[model samples]
Target chain A: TNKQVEISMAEWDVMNIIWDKKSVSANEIVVEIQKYKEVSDKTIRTLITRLYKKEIIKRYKSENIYFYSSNIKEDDIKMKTAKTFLNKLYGGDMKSLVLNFAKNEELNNKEIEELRDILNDISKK
Target chain B: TNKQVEISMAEWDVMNIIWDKKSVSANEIVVEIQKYKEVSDKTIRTLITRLYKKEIIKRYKSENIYFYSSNIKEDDIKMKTAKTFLNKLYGGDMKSLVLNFAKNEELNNKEIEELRDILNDISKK
Candidate 1:
C-alpha cells in the first residue's frame, strides 16, 4: 500500500461531484464540475475513465448512461492524503502537523479556544 | 498557478528531508530517505533532479557537494494540498471538510475542541 497512488487535479474535481452525490452519471458530473472549472465534456469523460482505471471510482451502466460511485471511503482517502501532506511538510511527524496548523495565525480566537479545549481533552486521555 | 503542478511521491520524500533540514546534500538526502524506503541511490538522485527541474527545490554547489533547500513556503504547499483534498472529498465545500474531520471518532476530544474553536473563529470573522 506504500505505492504512490493519486488522482490528477482535474480528475479530483469530477470525483468530488460524484462523491457528494453518492452516484452520478457522467453528464451530471460534467455539469456540476464545469460550474467551478471550465472543463469540456470530453475532458470530464477522460477524467472519469482515468479514475475508473485507478479504482478510485467505479462505473456501471444504467439506462444507457454510465453512473459512477467513489470506490474508496472519504475518511480513508483523507487520512492517506493527510499522511502524504505530513510527509512532505512535516517530515511525517504527527506532532509537527498538528502544531503547525494550530499555530496558523489566521485562526480566530474562538478557533484557538476550541483547539485549546481539544488539546486539553487529548492530554487527559 | 492551478496548472496541475505537483511533486511525485518519491520526490516528496526527498523534498521533505531537505525541507526539514533546511539544506542538505543529495547524498545526505539519499541516506536519510533510504531508511524509510528501499530505493536505489540513483532513484533518490533522479527524484532530486526532477524536483529541481520543477523548481520545488533549489540547489547550489559548495565544495563539490550540491546542497538543496525548499523554494516554496511550507504553508503555501499545505494550503494548496488541503484545497485539493477538499475538492476531491468534499466537493470543495469548506464546511464539509471541517465537519468530516470533526466527526472522525479517532480524533479524540482535544482535536474536536480545537476544530470547534477554529470554526468559531472563522464564524466570527
Candidate 2:
C-alpha cells in the first residue's frame, strides 16, 4: 500500500530541518524557523506533530530529549517533488518543463548555459 | 496588491488545465479532469470561481460561453512556486536543493548528469 502523499509548503519546512540535521530537537526547528519567520514555538510543535502523524518523521527519545528524524529520505522527497512539479504543472510533459526554465533568463545566465548543454547531451543519447 | 498565495495540490490541478488552454470553458476542465480523476463538475466550477475571486484568473463571456485565462502567467506562478520550493524545503539554500536532486539515483540517470552540468556551469560563474 502506497501511503505516499504530496506535502504542503508549511510541512516542507518541518521536513527540511529534520533532513538537514538527520535528527533534531523540536527546539532546534523553532529556533531556525523563527530566524526567518515569526512562527511561534507552539506552531512549530504542531507542524512536527503533523509530520509525525503523516509518517514523514519519527522521534526517538534520548536521555529525555526527543530527537526527530525524517522517515522519508531527502532523495525520495526530491523525486516525488520532481514528479509533482512536472505532473502538476506540465502534465508530465518534459519539453514544457524544460522550456519554462529556458525562459526564466533572469534566474541565472550561467545556469541556462549548463541546462542547454545538458539538454544537448541528452539529445545524442 | 499582494494577493499572491500558495495553492493546494487540488487547486493546482485546476490551474494546470487553465494554464495549458490559456482560455477554457469551465465545462472543458471538468471533462478533462474527470478523465483521470472522478472530480465533480460543480467542484471544477468552484475551483474556477475561486481562481476568479483570487484574481488568479479572469474570464470573458462570448456567445453565452465563459472562457477563462489566467490573470497570472505561467512564469509568475512557477517563479512563486520556485521561491516557495526553496524557502519551504531548503530554507532558500540553492546548494542543498541541487544536492537533493544529485542524490536521487533512480529518477533519471541523465537528469542527474544535467543537474551536475548545471552545477558545474554555476561553479565557474
Candidate 3:
C-alpha cells in the first residue's frame, strides 16, 4: 500500500468525516466541517477530490448522489501520523515527546491514572 | 514577525544545526547533518537558503565565510511545532496523545517514575 501519501491538515478534516460516517456526500462533509471551521463549500469539495486522488478515501455513486468512504482505517492513519509527528518534532524520541506533553497541567486524575497503569504494565513486562 | 512560515522536514534538519551551534558556516552544517542522514551538499545548502528566505534563520558574512544563525529561539520553534502536531494528529488533546505514547514498551522504570511524578504534581495542583 502507498502509505507514504501525505495528507494535508485540510484534507485530514475531510477524512475524519468520511471515517466517522463511513459514507457521505460532498455536501454532508461541508455541513459538518463548517460547524467547527469556516471553510468554503468549494474548498471542502476540493479536499474530497484530493483525498480520492491520494487513495485516502474512495467514492461511489448511490442513486444520484456521490458518497465517499475511507479506504484507510482511522487507527491506521492516526498511528502513522503519530509516528511522523514524533520524528518531526522530537527526532523519534517518544519518551521525550511524552514527557514534554506531561508538562500540560490540564491532564486530569483519570487520565493520569490511565497513564500510571500503562507505565506499571511496562515496568511489569 | 512571520511565525507562520511553514518549515518542511528537510529544512528543519538544516535549522537544527544552526540552532545547535548558534552560528555555523554552510559547509559545517552540511557536515554535521550528514552524520545522521545521507544528503547532497547542494540540497543542504538549498535548505539553508530557503530558511534564510523564510526569515527562520539569518546569515552573516564573518571574515570571508558565510555564517548562519537561528533568527528564532529553539524553544519558540519547538513549542510552535508541538502545538501544530497536537492539533494535526490529536485535535489538541494533550492527555490522549500522552496515553497513546504510553503504549510504547521501551519506556523504562526511570522514565515511568518521572511520568508518575509529573502526573502526581498535576493532580496535586
Candidate 4:
C-alpha cells in the first residue's frame, strides 16, 4: 500500500500545490508557488519535471496545455513521512513520541483530554 | 530552550554516536558509524567537523586526540524535530498525528492499552 516514494523538501512544495489543486497546468503551479516561495519559475519548473521523471506525478494534455495530477495518494506519502520521522527521531516508539509532546509542554490540558478520548475510542475498537 | 539547530541527516548519524558514547574521539565515531554506514573516513570526519562548526558538539584535547561531546541536549533536538515535522506534515495538529497512527493500525491492542494508561497518568498531572 506504500512505496516510500522519496520526495525532496523542495519537491514537496510543488506536490502540495498540485495535491490541493488536484490538477494544474505547469504555468498555474509556477504562479501558485510564487505566492509563497521566492523560487524562480525556472526552478519551480525543474521541480515539476523531477516529479514527472520520478513518476510521482502524471501529466495529460488537454487542448494543447498539459495538466498534472498526483500519481500517488497524499495519505500514503503522509503515512510514509510520519513513519520515517517517527523512526529517525523517536526510534519508532510511539509512546516516546507522544511523551515528548507532553514532557516538552507542547500539549495543553484540553489537548491532553482530547487525546485521552481518542485513545479510548481506539481502545474500544 | 530550542534554537532549532539545523542538523542534516548525515550529521545526525555522527550526533547519535556522540550522544550515546557521551565522549568519543574522531576515530571512535568513524569506527562506529562505518559499521552501520559504509561511509569513508573522510566523509565521517567531514560530518564531525561540520557538527563542530555548527557548535553542536564540543571537543577538548584529552592527551593528544580530541574527544567530542554534544553541546545540545538530545531531548531538545528530538522535541524540535518533532514539532517541526508535526507542523510541516500535519499542520501542527497533534490529534491528527496520533489519529494517523491509530487509523493506520500501527498500534496493536497491547500498545493501545499502554497508551491509554500513559494518557491516564498524564491526565492526572
Candidate 5:
C-alpha cells in the first residue's frame, strides 16, 4: 500500500464529508459541507477533483454519479497531524500539549468526568 | 493589519529558521535550514520568496544582504492552528482529545509529575 499523503486543512474539510459518508457525489459533498460551512459547488468540486487526481481519494462512477470516498482513513490522518503538531510545537512533549489544551478548555462536567475515567483506567495498568 | 495567513508544513520548515533568527538573507536561511533537512537552495529560496510575496514574511535590504524575518508571529500562528484543530476535529471536546493523547503517550516520570501539578492547579480553580 502507498504511504501517507499530506492533506492541507482546506482539503481536510472536503475529506471530512467523504469520511462521514463512505460514498458521496460531489454535489452531495457540497451540500453536506454547506450545513457547516457556506461554500460553492466549484470549490467543493475542485477539492474533490484535486484529491481524486492525487489518489488521496478514490471514486467510482455509479449511476452517472461520481461517488467519492477517501483513500486515506480519518484516524490515520488525525494521528499523523496530531503527532506532528505535538512534536514540532511542543518538542515531542505530549504532556505539555495536553496540559496546555486542558487548562484552556472549558469542559462540561460530563467531559471532565470522562477524562478522569480515562486517567483512572490508565492507573490500573 | 492583514489577517492571519496559513503556511503549509513544508513551508514551516523554511519559516522555522526565520523564527529562530530575527534577520537573515535568503542564503543565510538556506544554510540554517540545511543543518536539519537535506534540501536544495531552490526549495528554501522558493519558500522564502513565496512567504515574502504573501507578506507572511518581512524582508529588508541591509548592505544588499536582503535580511528576512517572519511578518506573522510564531505564537500567533501556533495558537490559531492549535485552536482550530481542537475545535474542528474534536468538535470543541478538548478533554477527550487530551485524554486520548495522554493514554497513547509514553511519559517519563518528570513529565508525568508535571502533568500532575497542572491537574492539581486546575483542582484549585
Candidate 6:
C-alpha cells in the first residue's frame, strides 16, 4: 500500500460525492460539493485530473460528456486510510484507536455494543 | 474543525516515529524512519520543518541539538483523521465505515464481538 496515496481535503469532498452516486460528470460533482463547501469548477477539474492520474478514478466518454467512476473500491480506501491514520497517531495500536474514538463520544451506545460483541466473538475463537 | 488541517504521508511517518520516542532530534528521526522507508536526512529535515510550521510539532534547543515534541495531542489527531477518512470514503456513513472494516479481515473475532457490544450499548441508550 506504499503507493504514494495522497488526497487533499477538497479533493476528498468531490470523491465523497462521486462515491455516493457511483458515476457523475464534473458538473454534477461541482453542484453536489458546492452545498457543503465552496469550490470552483476549475478547482474540481484539477482534483478530477489528479484522481485520474492517480488511477483512483476512471473517466468514460458518454455523448461527449465525461462520466467518472471510482477505480479504487471505497472499502479498500477506507481500510488503507484508517490504517494510515492509526499508524500515524496511535503508533499502530488498534486498541488505542478504538479507545480514543470511544472517549471522544464519537461512538453511540449502539456502536459501543457493536464493539463489545465483536470482541466477544473473537474470545470464542 | 475547519481549521485547514493537513499533513503529508511522509510527515505522518516522521510523526509516528517521534510519537513513539517523544522529543527526538532530526538525526534520530532520520535514523528511525530509514528502517522501513528510504527517506534522506534532508527529506526528513524538510518534513520536520513543515510539521513545525503547521504548529503540530514544537522544538526545543538543547546544546545545539533540537528536540521535537508533538504540539497537538495524539488522541485529537486520531479522531480528526478517522472522521476525515469516514467522511471521504463512506460519505459520512458510520455504519458503512464499521462494516467495511469488519469485512476487510482487519479485525479479529475479538474485535467483532467488541463491535457488537458497542452496538448493544447504543441500543440501550
Best by lDDT: 4
TM-scores vs. true structure, each candidate: 0.72, 0.77, 0.81, 0.85, 0.70, 0.76
* Candidate 6 lDDT tens digits, A49-113: 99888887888899999999988776677688777766777766566666677788887766566
Tens digits of per-residue lDDT for model 1 on A1-125? 64556777566677667778999999998888777767789988998888888888888899998899998776767656655665566665544544455455534556555645544444453
Q: On residues B7-59, what C-alpha lDDT tens digit does candidate 2 reach at each position? A: 56678888888888888999998898898988789988988888888888888
TM-scores of chain A across candidates: 0.76, 0.81, 0.82, 0.81, 0.85, 0.77
lDDT (C-alpha, whole model) for all candidates: 0.69, 0.71, 0.75, 0.85, 0.72, 0.76
Per-residue lDDT over B38-90 for candidate 5, one digit per residue giving the tens place of the 0 to 100 score = 99999888888889988889977999689988888776676667778776566
> By descending lDDT, how would the candidates be arranged?
4, 6, 3, 5, 2, 1
Clash pairs detected, candidate 4: none
Candidate 4 wrong stretches, greater than 4 Å: A1-4, A30-40, B1-4, B34-37
Given the true complex, what DockQ would model 4 score? 0.61
What order do you get sorting by DockQ, best first?
4, 6, 3, 2, 1, 5
Judged by DockQ, which candidate is best?
4
Off by over 4 Å in 1: A1-6, A55-61, A91-95, A102-106, A110-125, B1-6, B91-105, B108-125
On residues B1-125, what C-alpha lDDT tens digit does candidate 4 reach at each position?
54547789667778878999999999999999888658999999998998898899999999999999999989888888887777666778877878887887787889989988898679886
Clashing residue pairs in all predictions, respectively, total: 8, 0, 0, 0, 0, 43
Model 3 lDDT per residue over B1-125, tens place: 34476688777788777877999999999999899888999999999888898888888899999998988766556666777777766777655565565554334567667765655554454
Task: List each model's interface RMSD.
Answer: 6.2, 6.1, 4.3, 1.6, 3.9, 4.5
Better of 1 and 5 by TM-score: 1
| Steric clash pairs (candidate 1) | A110-B117, A111-B117, A111-B118, A114-B113, A114-B114, A114-B117, A115-B114, A118-B110
- What are the per-residue Cα lDDT tens digits for candidate 3 across A30-89? 999999878999999998888899888888899899999988867656766777766766
Cα lDDT tens digits for candidate 1, B6-114: 7765566887788779999999998998787699999889888888888888888999889999987866676566556555666554445444554564455664555
Tell me the docking grade of candidate 3. Answer: acceptable
Q: What is the TM-score of chain A in candidate 3?
A: 0.82
Greater TM-score among 1 and 6 belongs to: 6
